[PDB]
Each structure stands twice: as C-alpha cells, then as structure tokens.
C-alpha cells in the first residue's frame, strides 16, 4: 500500500491575543485608577479626569461616572464625571 511523500508549511505561527478594548462603558461607576480603555495608539483620547499611560491605556483619575464623547475631527474622548 503506497504512501506518497508529503511536503510542509512555513506558516504555522500566530501571536497571543491581547484582549484590547474599552473596559468600562458610559454610565459605569469607576474608582480612581480604573482602566477604561486598552488600545493601540490613541483610538480614544483622554478627556476630563482621565489619564493616559505609556501604552496608550486610559484610566480614571477620580472616583466618578464614565462618559464618552464623539468630537468629529477632534477625535473620540472618554471622560470621568465626579459623582
């Protein structure tokens, strides 16, 4: 019973998924330090009471309520509104 030879693939690789994205949505209660957005680049920009880490991560500076805001050419912003 003849078993004909086979070749191979040079493609098998792929990298670990990074679980990127918004972690807190509009109207959600967050505490200072809470991560709001995981992102590559400034897909979302920091607004009022929101800081940005070295890896573009958005987080809360104060205890408050999350609010989103779309500003056209200016971009999309995530705020935290104090309670």
């Amino acid at each position: 019973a003849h078993k004909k030879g086979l070749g191979s693939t040079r493609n098998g690789r792929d990298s670990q998924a990074k679980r990127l994205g918004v972690k807190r949505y509009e109207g959600q209660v967050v505490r200072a330090g809470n991560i709001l957005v995981r992102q590559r680049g400034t897909r979302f920009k920091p607004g009022k009471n929101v800081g940005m880490g070295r890896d573009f991560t958005l987080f809360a500076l104060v205890d408050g309520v999350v609010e989103f805001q779309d500003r056209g050419r200016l971009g999309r912003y995530v705020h935290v509104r104090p309670l």
């Binding site: 003849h2 004909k4 086979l6 070749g7 191979s8 693939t9 493609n11």
Partner: peptide
C-alpha cells in the same frame, strides 16, 4: 492538492 496525497501538510 497533488494526486493521491493525504489530508493536511498545508494548502
């Protein structure tokens, strides 16, 4: 795939 080969080993 070439004739009479088996499944797998790439497209």
């Amino acid at each position: 795939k070439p004739l009479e080969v088996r499944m797998g080993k790439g497209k």
